[PDB]
Design a protein around this ligand. Structure first.
Ligand code: CCU
Lengths: 213, 228
């Protein structure tokens, strides 16, 4: 009668609430508890039994955890309206266009985290952006972009944040992605966790996303 | 090549203000003062006081009035409150017209934040009790984004600043709150001394954007008058 879910903050701005809402409709007397935490912290939390399921954006390998890829969400570049990158609808924008920009990454919690994921995509292609500043969370990064502080790379679903003179630019590199995983304990076999997984599949089928296994 | 400490201006702000007018104010300020280095620091109102006193920041944007002899402040405006509700909540049918505080008393209300005190939740609760209203279903959460997320999940409602409308979550609706005192103040605080020329310029920028937005302000609001 109590399910504990760990989640990275950005998911609040995307599909997480509609999943929980449909999930609620199937379980009118379940106590649902949500806890914002990083993907590495979710792994430790699952092992200690502090949460039952974790929704994250890193693939942390650990025998005690069963991890499953839900979908490959795209990354976008958040910029101020007047930024030159916002003038490139014609040809579009690649990662190698971003290398000399002031880039705002997040979170500032211990590594590995979302900024490590983003920097790895650069390094995967021999790119190393030299001007990086780490901030607490995605909404702060975006507010700072709007204030004129630089640019940021964010999941496409954070476009629910529509700040004055903030524009989101697509990235052309096919691997400019931020996958979303569900993680549970390796011998998890609960009805509640199965139902949660089916609820995600119902939203995806309705939303037109590719179904996970 | 590095900028001088004299031409560096440090600005403290509460995080939720990034959803309203603060960013365009800062952007415009930067654009009009290209030889200034502006540094921005997220901090709560209480921390802003010690920071101003010690020189760690030069101006602080906050939502609380915490009196300290070393500091002075100007009320920039009283921002309206709204009720964040799930699209399918009955209260959402009064979205065009708005609702009153006494309509919310038996609703599942999500208050926030958790840590600081006094905060937004006590201020919200004080507006209820100012009118002999005591909400019976109070659940407190850590932060505004989790409150909004749980409302979007249909687990309750939350009273939020009007600028929160920048965050448009799926199946989340913002309903106007009609009580004229259902407001939340925004302040600029500075050291209790004559404002530097740089802070006076920041005042000028605020006045400019507030005029573009059409806000009503009293005579001599934020206005510098010469000492000679
Ligand atoms: O750090 C990580 O493990 C991943 C994501 C963090 C934050 C977010 O998506 O908002």
């Amino acid at each position: 009668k109590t399910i504990r879910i760990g989640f990275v903050g950005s998911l609040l701005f995307g599909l997480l609430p509609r999943i929980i809402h449909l999930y609620r409709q199937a379980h009118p007397n379940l106590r649902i508890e949500l806890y914002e935490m990083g993907t590495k912290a979710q792994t430790e939390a699952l092992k200690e039994g502090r949460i039952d399921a974790g929704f994250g954006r890193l693939k942390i390998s650990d025998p005690a955890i069963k991890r499953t890829l839900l979908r490959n969400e795209r990354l976008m570049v958040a910029v101020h309206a007047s930024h030159p990158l916002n003038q490139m609808k014609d040809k579009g924008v690649h990662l190698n266009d971003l290398i000399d920009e002031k880039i705002l990454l997040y979170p500032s919690s211990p590594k590995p985290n979302f900024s490590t994921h983003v920097m790895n995509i650069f390094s995967d292609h021999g790119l190393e952006p030299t001007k990086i500043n780490e901030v607490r969370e995605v909404q702060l990064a975006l507010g700072l972009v709007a204030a004129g502080e630089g640019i940021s790379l964010v999941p496409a679903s954070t476009q629910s944040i529509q700040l004055f003179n903030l524009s989101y630019v697509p990235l052309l590199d096919p691997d400019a992605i931020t996958p979303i995983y569900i993680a549970v304990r390796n011998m998890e076999e609960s009805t509640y966790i199965y139902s949660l997984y089916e609820t995600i599949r119902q939203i995806y089928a309705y939303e037109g996303f590719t179904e996970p296994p």
